[PDB]
A paper describes a structure:
Mammalian target of rapamycin complex 1 (mTORC1) serves as a central regulator of cell growth and proliferation by integrating signals from growth factors, nutrients, energy status, and cellular stress. Like other small GTPases, the function of Rheb is dictated by its guanine nucleotide binding states: it is active in the GTP-bound form and inactive in the GDP-bound form. The Y35N mutant assumes a very similar overall structure as the WT Rheb with a typical small GTPase protein fold composed of a six-stranded β-sheet surrounded by four α-helices.
To investigate the molecular basis for the constitutive activation of mTORC1 by the Y35N mutant, we determined the crystal structures of Y35NGppNHp and Y35NGDP at 2.0 Å and 2.1 Å resolution, respectively. The overall structure of Y35NGppNHp is very similar to that of WTGppNHp; superposition of the two structures using the secondary-structure matching method yields a root mean square deviation (RMSD) of 0.45 Å for 169 Cα atoms. In WTGppNHp, the side chain of Tyr35 covers on the top of the phosphate-binding pocket and forms a hydrogen bond with the γ-phosphate of GppNHp. In Y35NGppNHp, the side chain of Asn35 flips into the bottom of the phosphate-binding pocket and points toward the α-phosphate and β-phosphate of GppNHp (about 90° rotation relative to that of Tyr35 in WTGppNHp). Besides, the binding modes of GppNHp and Mg2+ are essentially identical to those in WTGppNHp. When the WT and Y35N Rheb structures are superimposed onto the Rheb‒mTORC1 structure, residues Pro37 and Ile39 of switch I in both WTGppNHp and Y35NGppNHp could interact with Phe977 and Arg1301 of mTOR. In other words, Y35NGDP mimics WTGppNHP in binding to mTOR and thus is capable to activate mTORC1 in a similar way as WTGppNHp. These results indicate that the Y35N mutation induces switch I in either GDP-bound or GppNHp-bound form to adopt a conformation similar to that seen in WTGTP and thus can make a tight interaction with mTOR, leading to constitutive activation of mTORC1.
Numbering used by the authors: 3 to 171
Write the structure that this text describes.
């Protein structure tokens, strides 16, 4: 049997939302992408013996002034909130996006996963692992660091959001 679940991937511009999603879906790293308008993939994945049809909504980068789109606040089973460990701006912005998201969804509990991407860029890192982890803990959210170059880290991100969604019955 298969379960159908819809996941939105959100964050600031150029944090690697598309590259992470593509690494998961297609198993390859894309060196340069167009800025996203909106893409949607359906990917088969098994989590704890359960097969899922994952509908993955890869969204346009938002900044702190972006209206959080209402279409992403209904009928979504899980959220992946992505920043880059190389960008302080992306980290400030993900805090704003999170607040707007929580406003939109209202009194329904939603699974949220915070992801610090581009961890392979050691020389450009400006955010520690610990600051990301502390933020996730304050949100009661899952936390992982990832690299879109590293297939296992991308797979782990999508498995984890599913694990978290399942916990909410
Ligand atoms: N070294 C490294 N580069 C990455 C990683 N993730 C993304 N990039 C690079 O960073 C740039 C932006 O990636 P992209 O996936 O387009 O980011 P995005 O969040 O989808 N941008 P947008 O919000 O405009 O749709 C690309 O050049 C991409 O190859 C990563 O984990 N490591
Ligand atoms: Mg993109």
């Amino acid at each position: 049997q298969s379960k159908s679940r819809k996941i939105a991937i959100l964050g600031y511009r150029s944090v690697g939302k598309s590259s992470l999603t593509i690494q998961f879906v297609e198993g390859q790293f894309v060196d340069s992408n167009d800025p996203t308008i909106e893409n949607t993939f359906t990917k088969l994945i098994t989590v704890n013996g359960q097969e899922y049809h994952l509908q993955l909504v890869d969204t346009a980068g938002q900044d702190e002034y972006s209206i959080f789109p209402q279409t992403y606040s209904i009928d979504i089973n899980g959220y992946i909130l992505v920043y880059s460990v190389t960008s302080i701006k992306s980290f400030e912005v993900i805090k704003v996006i999170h607040g707007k998201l929580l406003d939109m969804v209202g009194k329904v509990q939603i699974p949220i996963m915070l992801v610090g991407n581009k961890k392979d860029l050691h020389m450009e890192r400006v955010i520690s692992y610990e600051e990301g982890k502390a933020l996730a803990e304050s949100w009661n959210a899952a936390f992982l660091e990832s690299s879109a170059k590293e297939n296992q880290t991308a797979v782990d991100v999508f498995r984890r959001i599913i694990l978290e969604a399942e916990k909410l019955e």
